[PDB]
């Protein structure tokens, strides 16, 4: 039976900021915070993922206030807190969910210092998380249809011949952001069949801006169920869309590193 | 044993992918997927009539060579060429007896005094993986060298170099969607190119990459695994998210 480790790691999230306890105060009830990722050893930003499905900082539990949308998460003593509120299951989709209440950890504001609330699972960039020490986004060259490269310009995205900008920073919150302006997001406005995906701002952190690279080679919008698609397998159209997964080459991609 | 065909004669990018997709399709039933990553079948409990699959390779010259892949790790254990079979030196003895189930109809089985590991094949071929060019051409010329070694035409260094090509172009491309993509762009432009430090490090990390992902917490590694950019660079991985579009197959190491 597989070994059960308990790694200590930073939980990077919305807009590349990490999971932090406010001000480093560990008294029971203090707010858990969205904060720039540090390069230090202070336990305020390092979290141990224990076997009992609990995220702990300096020995204390990341605890949601209640079991309803809007309540914030506080640091609290693990034994004194309620068992059901101290528990979290981190899914391979980037969300961090609580088994009871069906509420995922959301960051309703990309500003530094946002108290982490817990909201309804709409698979938003606000509620996409990644436990890593790499506190800098992974920047790659995304290659897809016919070997072309995903390129962006001032709000327009398509594929073109791979010229060595075509660079994209894969943020921990599940967003894909053009390198030159990393405040902009790979956004889609609707859960419809041919909504052109382009570059907007990362403010709303909605779904349509959150993407997971599935093992089958696609780039899926988790809330949509449709994948990134070059329209009619035609790069010259300069058009990319969300389309139901069929598996053809015009929706298969690869993050070159 | 299941047989899967490929030919460098008229090989297109799609003719390469469905091949690797068919190889993956028979290397594992896809039943055990852990953290979006599929697992090869467990050596313990696997029937020997399900222990191997065979890939048949042909080329512009219509020379045929059939490789044998160990289902538990997708690595090449041997190959039949016409009337003769050839096997790498087995590591243990349980693997030495399963070899006897492979090419039974042929006359003269052969087992080399060397195993099929990169560092020894690199030693035998006198060249490193970082220098041996990969692509359709190299695979074509390698198919010939495996066929003619039986007739004394192929020498041992060219034999070992052919092994490094096939293993990388088949086994590794099955394990990694990334390395398959590296062979993908080579067919696309008709290139003869040695692999990056990116491909080399992935090949050298596969066993460790499987352990850490399976032995991971529900997502996170207990320890990092350092890798490479296409340009030789520093970067380490701490979670399985970045690896999902990269690793296609994992060796079994433990139970969920």
């Amino acid at each position: 039976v597989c070994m059960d480790p308990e790694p200590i790691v930073r939980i990077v999230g919305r807009n590349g900021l990490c999971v932090d306890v406010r001000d480093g105060r560990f008294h029971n009830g203090n707010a858990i915070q969205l904060w720039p990722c540090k390069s230090n050893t202070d336990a305020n930003q390092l979290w141990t993922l224990k076997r009992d499905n609990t995220i702990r900082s300096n020995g204390k539990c990341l605890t949601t206030y209640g079991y309803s949308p809007g309540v914030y998460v506080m640091i609290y003593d693990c034994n004194t807190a309620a068992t059901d509120a101290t528990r979290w299951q981190i899914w391979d989709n980037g969300t961090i969910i609580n088994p009871r209440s069906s509420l995922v950890l959301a960051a309703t504001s990309g500003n530094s210092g946002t108290t982490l609330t817990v909201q309804t699972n709409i698979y938003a960039v606000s509620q996409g998380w990644l436990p890593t020490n790499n506190t800098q986004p992974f920047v790659t060259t995304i290659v897809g249809l016919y070997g072309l490269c995903l390129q962006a310009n001032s709000g327009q995205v398509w594929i073109e011949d791979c010229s060595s900008e075509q660079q994209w920073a894969l943020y921990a919150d599940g967003s894909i952001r053009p390198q030159q302006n990393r405040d902009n997001c790979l956004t889609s406005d609707s859960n419809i069949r041919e909504t052109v995906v382009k570059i907007l701002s990362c403010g709303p952190a909605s779904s349509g801006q959150r993407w997971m690279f599935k093992n089958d080679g696609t780039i899926l919008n988790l809330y949509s169920g449709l994948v990134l698609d070059v329209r009619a397998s035609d790069p010259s159209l300069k058009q990319i869309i969300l389309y139901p997964l069929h598996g053809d080459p015009n929706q298969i991609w690869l993050p070159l590193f | 044993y299941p047989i899967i065909n490929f030919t460098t004669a008229g090989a297109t990018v799609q003719s390469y992918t469905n091949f690797i997709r068919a190889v993956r399709g028979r290397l594992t039933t896809g039943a055990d997927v852990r953290h979006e990553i599929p697992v090869l079948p467990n050596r313990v409990g696997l029937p020997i009539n399900q222990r191997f699959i065979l890939v048949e390779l042909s080329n512009h010259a219509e020379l045929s060579v059939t490789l044998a892949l160990d289902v538990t790790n997708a690595y090449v254990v041997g190959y039949r060429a016409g009337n003769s079979a050839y096997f790498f030196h087995p590591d243990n003895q349980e693997d030495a007896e399963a070899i006897t189930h492979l090419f039974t109809d042929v006359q003269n089985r052969y087992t080399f005094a060397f195993g099929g590991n990169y560092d020894r094949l690199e030693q035998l071929a006198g060249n490193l993986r970082e220098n041996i060019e990969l692509g359709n051409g190299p695979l074509e010329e390698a198919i010939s060298a495996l066929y003619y070694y039986s007739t004394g035409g192929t020498q041992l260094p060219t034999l070992a170099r052919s092994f490094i090509i096939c293993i990388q172009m088949i086994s590794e491309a099955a394990r990694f969607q990334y390395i398959e993509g590296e062979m993908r762009t080579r067919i696309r432009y008709n290139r003869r190119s040695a692999p990056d430090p990116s491909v080399i490090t992935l090949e050298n990390s596969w066993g460790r990459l499987s352990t850490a992902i399976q032995e991971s917490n529900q997502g996170a590694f207990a320890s990092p695994i350092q890798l490479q950019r296409r340009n030789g660079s520093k970067f380490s991985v701490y979670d399985v998210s970045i690896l999902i579009p990269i690793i296609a197959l994992m060796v079994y190491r433990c139970a969920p």
Partner: nanobody
Amino acid sequence: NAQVQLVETGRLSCVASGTFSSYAMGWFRAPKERDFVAISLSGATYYQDSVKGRFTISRDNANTVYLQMNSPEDTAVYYCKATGERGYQGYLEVWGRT
């Protein structure tokens, strides 16, 4: 050095000189820029926003791909377009001759 000849007729009909490989199919429409109309490899489908439901594009690799027009501003010259990977380019694109 040779290419496919997409000869168009027509229910618009279009044939190639290999569609098995040739990726997708594309119909393009007035004496205005050459806008888009409408299949993937399998293939599936991609229609322009003006002509959803009215138009249907079909495929059968085993060398033809159609386009059925059902139900004035759509009057123009329509061309069938092909895509795929290359051996000559950077990728393959073929326009036809209706």
